[PDB]
Structures are given as structure tokens and as C-alpha cells.
Amino acid sequence: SEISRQEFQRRRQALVEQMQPGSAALIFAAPEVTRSADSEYPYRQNSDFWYFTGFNEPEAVLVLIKSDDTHNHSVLFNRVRDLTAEIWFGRRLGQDAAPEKLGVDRALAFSEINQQLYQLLNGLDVVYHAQGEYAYADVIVNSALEKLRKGSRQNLTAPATMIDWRPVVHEMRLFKSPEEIAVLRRAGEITAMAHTRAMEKCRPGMFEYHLEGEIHHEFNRHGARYPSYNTIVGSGENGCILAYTENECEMRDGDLVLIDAGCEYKGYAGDITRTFPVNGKFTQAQREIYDIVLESLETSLRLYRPGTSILEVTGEVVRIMVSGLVKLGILKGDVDELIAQNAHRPFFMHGLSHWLGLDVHDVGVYGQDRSRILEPGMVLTVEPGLYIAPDAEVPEQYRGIGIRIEDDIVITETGNENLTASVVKKPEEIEALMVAARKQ
């Protein structure tokens, strides 16, 4: 499953439909990024630029011109063919092949952008530009507008109105096409296979980073070369650090390990968390905390549907958590009073759900306190957790336990589809999986 040229074209047209007549939208590629000295990190295209192109080169700009209500066209600026640059650093699409390959009307050399961009903006009423997204982009746009403003003797005029297209584009990205959902489904499957593998490989004495290695290898074998975010492998007390990425410790017999990892497949993020015993068997204390987090997730998965909200479902989770923590003596008092005091917050301090897509923390308006009403096509995570610090004033057997369990779902007409349920999460199923692996 992938996103095709025709879908990128549909997206461009959908943006154009929303634009004022006599306008242009400017969408800039990500800059290359230094890792150390003359070496660069592996290139990651800007998500919005990718969304409209599927084009994985830097020094590229998509220009959508809406001349009036019926006439519109697209111009791509991108790197020229250059034999020497290509022998050294890789092939470039160039100008000749770009119109057919990407489905744009015209392509020009990026080297000519300052000589050409102002000519494309001349006489328009509106420019759509994500001001502040990239310094190099702001420089180019500001220079073009200045040339126009100062060019009345050459009969040039600048568009007086600049509109940030990010809100419009992010609202588009918030609602996935069936093709996007298919890509995210595959990302979920790939990510789930990696998590199953980590559970089957984990043994006391392995380092946290060893499970990262297994996970990243599994991503790669299915064609997801890169993770969508830095892998978290937090064993023991490290599980109480939310985005622990050091992954530097030897995993101890008797500790839990929390793994938060996701692949990036055709630009889209998977995002799964599983927590499990390093030695394949939950202790009683570990199981007691685990059960509360799992009940929170299972209830959320029953509830998520069009017409509810992340806020509403969070309320149900908070009650489950406070109730369970009271039962274990971690919290003390009346459940309703404790809920009113947000007494869960020392142990569950983050959100239940974030949007998921071309970014792991995907774009799109949540509403105040994540109250926005859910509709079909939205994709989100469900990630309750409980984190009991090593020095927490709680019964001693719970100290240093960090548990999160996270699935990715899509809202459907009739509820939700769980994209990541192919990796187990019921404690008896986790134990059975690990027992079977440990016998090999």
C-alpha cells in the first residue's frame, strides 16, 4: 500500500479549491540537516511538502497558482540534473522528468527561484505561505515580495495578503483517505511484528538497546527503513521516564520493560507501546498496576467512535485509574473527591490520545482540552499509562514501575478499527508468548 501520483494531484486540487482566485500557494521542502561536520542525517522530507508531492529531495518548492476560479496550474522548483553532483551524491529527478513523474505542469531549476518566483507572484492578490516554517523559505519569499513592492516602475505589484496555509492543510491531513488508512494499517502491522519480536527476543542480561536493534531490523525487513520517532526501551526505573531513549542499561531479571516504538512506512507513523516482564512473568505488584492500565485501554477501545471525544473517553480512564489506585492503597480517599482533585496526575501525567499520520504527533486541531467531536477518518493513539516513581510515597512494592500500553486506531462509521491489535497485550497472552519463546 502506498500513496500514488494521482492522490498527490487530488490533494493539490483540493487545496486549490480552497484558495482565493488570484493567488499562489508556496510549499517548501525540508533542508538537509548536519549530523556531524560534513556528514548529514538521512533525509526526511517536510510532511506538508511530502503530502502534496511524494517527492523526497531538498531544494524543492511547489507553487500552486490559482489564476481565477477555473484556471490553475502548478510549478515545481527542484534541483537540476548535474552529472558530477549525481555521480557523487545520488540521482536527481531534474526538470525534464518532473512533470510526468510528479504530475505537475511545469518544472524549473531551484537555482533560478529568485529570478522566477517574483514573476509568478506578480499581480496576485494573495500568497499562501507558512511563515516561520523554514528560515531559507522565508528569505526566498520575503525577497520576492520586496522585489515586487519596490518594482512599480517595472509595473510589478506584490500580493498584499499572506495567509498561513497550515491550518487548511492540517485539517486536510486530519481526515485520512482510504489509501492513507491502508498505509497506516500496514505501518501498524509492521510495528506490531517488531513489538512481538522484541517480546520473543527479550532475556535478562540483554541491554535495552538490543531490543531497539531487533525492532529496527524488523521495520527494515518490511521496507520501513526508518523509525517514526526515537525508540524508547525503558526497563525498571527507566520505564518511569516518558521518552527515555538512552536505552543503555542491562535489563534485570524481575523488572518490566516498556517499549515505545513505531515505524515510518511511506511517510506514515506507526506508534505502539507494550510493557512486559523482562523474565517473562509479571510479579503480583506488576500485574496489579498492569491490569489498571489494560482496563483503561480496553475500555477506551470499546468507547472510541464518532460523536465522542478524547476528553470524554479520558474521563472514563481517569475513573478506572483512581478506582484501581484506591483499591491498591496507592491513593487514599473517596474516588469522586480524588477524581475532582485530579489525584491520578502524579501517576498518569500525559494525554490519552494524539492524532497519528505523517507525523507521530500528527497535525490537526484538538479543541479545548481535546474536546473536539470525533468523526470517521480520524486516526489516533490510545495510550494510558501509570508511572510509580522509585521514591513515591506508596506501598513499597509498586515503586519504580512504569507501564504504558498503546494502540493506534482509526475512527470508522460504526466505532473504530484497531490497527495494532496483532501484538498481544493481555498479561496471560504476553506470558504465554514469552514462555514459548524462552523454551526455544
Taking the least distance from each CB to Mn ion, the nearer of 47 and 381 is 381
Q: Does 82 bind its own copies (CB under 8 A)?
A: no
C-beta of residue 93 within 8 angstroms of C-beta of residue 110: no
Q: According to the annotation, is 171 in a ligand binding site?
A: no
- Residue among 96 and 105 whose Cβ is closer to its own copies: 96
The stretches of 153-227 forming alpha helices (DSSP H) are 166-174, 178-201, 208-221
Task: Determine which residue in the list 53, 78, 196, 247 makes contact with its own copies, applying CB under 8 A.
Answer: 247
> Angle, to 10 degrees, between the axis of helix 427-438 and the axis of helix 284-303?
120
Q: Which of 328, 336, 300 is nearest to 316 (CA)?
A: 300
The piece of 281-289, 324-332, 358-366, 418-426 that touches its own copies (CB under 8 A) is 358-366
Closest C-alpha to 109, from 147, 54, 57: 57
**Binding window for its own copies (CB under 8 A); candidates: 33-41, 111-119, 189-197, 330-338:** 33-41
Query: In one letter, which amino acid is 308?
Result: T
398 binds its own copies (CB under 8 A): no
Q: Are β-strands 407-412 and 415-418 bridged in parallel, bridged antiparallel, or unpaired?
A: antiparallel
Sites of contact with Mn ion (CB under 5 A): 260, 271, 273, 381, 383, 406
Q: Which does 111 bind (CB under 5 to 8 A by kind): Cl ion, Mn ion, its own copies, none?
A: Cl ion
Q: Using CB under 8 A, pick the residue from 63, 64, 145, 184 that binds its own copies.
A: 145
Q: Are 366 and 218 in contact (CB under 8 A)?
A: no
Is the Cα torsion angle 198, 239, 223, 269 positive or negative in sign? positive
Q: H or E element: which one contains 275?
A: strand 272-277
Q: For residue 435, what is its C-alpha cell?
A: 514462555
Asked whether residue 133 is marked as a ligand-binding residue, the answer is no
418: partner contacted, choices its own copies, Mn ion, Cl ion, none (Cβ within 5-8 A by kind) = none
Beta carbon nearer to Cl ion, 28 or 304: 28
Please check if 129 is assigned to a binding site: no
If we measure between CA atoms, which residue out of 264, 249, 245 comes closest to residue 190? 264
Q: Which does 260 bind (CB under 5 to 8 A by kind): Cl ion, its own copies, Mn ion, none?
A: Mn ion
Q: Which of 59, 180, 189, 214 binds its own copies (CB under 8 A)?
A: 214
100 annotated among ligand-binding-site residues = no
CB of 11 to its own copies, least distance (A): 18
Breaks in the chain after residues (C–N exceeding 2.5 Å): none
Cell representation of residue 103: 504530475
**CA 138/CA 159 separation, integer angstroms:** 15
Give the phi and the psi of residue 262 in degrees, each rounded to 5.
-150, 145
- Binding site for Mn(2+), by residue number, is 260, 271, 354, 383, 406
Residue ranges that bind its own copies, judged by CB under 8 A: 30, 33-42, 44, 46-47, 86-91, 131-132, 142, 145-146, 149, 152, 155, 158, 160-164, 166-167, 207, 209-210, 212-214, 216-217, 220-221, 223, 225, 228-230, 240-247, 349, 358-361, 363, 365-366, 368, 387
